Symmetry: C2
Subunit: 106 residues, 2 copies
């Protein structure tokens, strides 16, 4: 809104805890910013090294999902069917940033 | 969007450089976050002390305006008739926050 950032990624697949990859093989770093009543994830498109993909056993306990898939009405649906609202998608200090908010399951 | 923050202030009047007051006499602290191609102001509703109102002569050089007035389509019009897009209005760490983006004059 008032930006020239373009379209958000169609999908984000986890590689290692907190590091995702989109349909273009670009890496995104996700950090948790937990509020009292809810959880937000700030995801930035930053080129980071990739080592081994983590085992799902380690990822089961994470606060972030295994995957996000672009869903109608500017939000993402994860692997557990939960919806994440895109609160903002902008360029910050030259880096593309998504601000996601985990919504209550309806 | 996905928030329960409510309505943004109808107006913000500068008191001292970077410190504004809304229609309820509540103080808001504004900081500049300048990008390469544009300028953003992050404004948070935080209770701060108020001393003397600054003289307009000192405020003429500031990057922030003397006042913001809520304008249709979620944006603010300042004292110079410029428009600022509200990119986000949310509660961050318990503090209400506005993220404004100065748009090119049209």
């Amino acid at each position: 809104a008032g930006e020239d950032v373009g379209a958000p990624p169609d999908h984000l697949w986890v590689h290692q805890e907190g590091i995702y990859r989109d349909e273009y093989q670009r890496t995104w770093v996700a950090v948790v910013e937990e509020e009292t009543s809810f959880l937000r994830a700030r995801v930035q498109q930053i080129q980071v090294p990739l080592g081994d993909a983590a085992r799902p056993s380690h990822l089961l306990t994470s606060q972030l999902p295994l995957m996000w898939q672009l869903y109608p009405e500017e939000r993402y649906m994860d692997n557990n069917s939960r919806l994440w609202q895109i609160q903002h998608h902008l360029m910050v200090r030259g880096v593309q940033e998504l601000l996601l908010k985990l919504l209550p399951d309806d």
